[PDB]
Ligand SMILES: Cn1cnc(Cn2c(=O)nc(Nc3cc4cn(C)nc4cc3Cl)n(Cc3cc(F)c(F)cc3F)c2=O)n1
């Protein structure tokens with residue numbers, strides 16, 4: 360029993376993390392087969408970072424301008440190119456610990472594990488959700504640029520996030536491994552605001568099911584609600600509207616607990632309207648929205 | 661910026677995890693050099709688990725009764741012994757991925773990373789604190805017996821926890837890697853209750869400092885309190901009493917933020933007395949006590 364924010368074991372990704380230095384600018388890269396992937400921001404000098412023209416900056420470089428270090432061993436760069444906001448450095452050595460992998464883009468509301476890294480050295484691991492506004496509420500300091508986020512299915516690592524920058528609100532923004540930003544951001548050292556966010560309703564409901572599976576039932580009630588009547592309440596509390604396709608995804612959890620989705624919605628409607636009255640759900644005093652239905656099924660039984 | 665429950669990268673430990681089977685009973689083991697460490701409970705048949713005499717059970721076994729599997733390769737057992745509640749199986753192959761390691765026992769209030777594992781296969785990673793009552797609020801299902809908890813300093817893995825059992829309240833109990841239980845528990849399949857718990861005051865204060873470092877300041881105030889006047893409030897709210905040695909450990913955080921420890925205590929005293937009034941601290945609506953001062957310094961700047 361128990362329910363915790365839990366990341367995937369990070370070993371498969373740790374073995375791929377390298378340091379990339381261009382002049383005096385340094386950050387983390389991802390070494391898969393004979394290619395290192397990293398934020399193209401590394402080719403900026405201090406005076407290029409505010410308003411870079413990356414095509415200009417890159418044509419002015421050659422392979423020998425890139426220092427790649429996999430622990431103590433220097434990897435020799437033998438080719439370089441740009442794909443959107445990621446730099447690809449072809450190296451002379453294929454990574455012998457390359458896992459089976461994919462580059463997948465995730466949807467808002469989905470979760471992934473972040474391996475925070477500094478100077479090519481992994482530092483910590485934790486779960487994150489892609490917010491509806493395409494930021495993530497991570498934990499990152501200077502030097503974390505190029506840290507990656509991922510999910511692991513069986514033996515295959517699905518890379519979904521490369522960390523670029525911190526926004527002024529303290530939330531974090533990045534790209535997929537094709538270099539395409541999540542959300543309306545650009546890789547410049549200028550202050551950029553996130554759009555308005557909203558709460559991921561299906562995740563909250565999934566978490567309430569996790570709570571019932573784990574014995575918290577004080578919030579249940581005899582009432583049911585209609586899909587449209589719940590959505591009137593959701594709109595008032597900045598929860599995203601609930602659809603039948605979402606009622607569908609909650610099917611297995613509704614079956615395990617024997618609590619109808621629309622019944623669980625009546626509980627959520629009451630919690631939103633009344634608060635929690637000094638009690639807790641799975642050790643939290645607010646409604647948690649960063650667990651997917653899959654996270655619940657993976658962790659409960 | 662940001663503050664998250666964050667585990668150590670688990671790769672060094674993943675490479676040590678094996679499956680140990682004795683007859684039909686199976687669980688996880690820890691393979692370091694040419695020794696596998698695992699809960700001695702594995703030598704119990706279904707009918708031995710309620711009231712085992714382990715010395716009896718073990719003398720009735722030979723090396724060939726133990727099946728150890730490191731992934732696909734079977735490790736040959738060439739010796740076996742008991743140390744308290746852990747079995748040590750000497751194998752014919754030294755683990756080529758043995759990290760630099762120590763066996764250390766931790767104190768209540770301290771944190772460690774748990775690598776949850778099933779059938780010798782790592783499943784997830786998350787942070788845990790040793791509660792004052794020597795349980796941990798983990799996330800474990802059937803088959804997790806033998807999962808380990810650890811901290812990593814530089815390159816050295818300090819193993820501090822081997823998971824044994826789940827108590828009826830849903831909390832988890834285990835031993836250090838010498839087989840000595842944390843808390844008043846025994847490795848029998850009988851229902852055992854945890855003693856009364858209490859809140860880890862210095863961790864709450866450390867977390868409030870983390871919040872100030874990260875820009876939550878609404879809970880600060882112009883007041884100070886005396887060490888004894890705070891402790892009268894702490895005793896009323898089941899917080900453990902605060903000592904000068906604890907004021908001392910919070911020194912660096914008090915210096916970074918410029919907020920005196922006893923000033924921060926006046927904030928905590930108010931929060932305990934008034935609640936939080938609909939606001940949050942670092943995304944939580946209750947006072948978090950599972951971050952040590954070291955966890956805060958490791959993650960903030
Ligand atoms: C506080 N924080 C939270 N997350 C981050 C991530 N992050 C980072 O690690 N580094 C950045 N700028 C650099 C400065 C360098 C100085 N040297 C010697 N080398 C450096 C490398 C970088 Cl990458 N930035 C800022 C930033 C990085 C970008 F990739 C980008 F497109 C715009 C930006 F403003 C950063 O956010 N820091």
Ligand SMILES: Cn1cnc(Cn2c(=O)nc(Nc3cc4cn(C)nc4cc3Cl)n(Cc3cc(F)c(F)cc3F)c2=O)n1
Nearest residue numbers: 360685686701800801802803804805824825826847848849
């Ligand atoms: C729900 N939960 C949360 N944590 C745990 C940990 N845990 C476990 O994984 N297994 C246990 N009993 C076994 C049954 C087996 C059946 N087969 C085929 N093999 C088995 C191996 C075990 Cl170890 N237990 C119970 C338990 C394990 C002990 F080590 C102990 F000393 C007393 C106990 F009651 C368990 O708690 N399950």
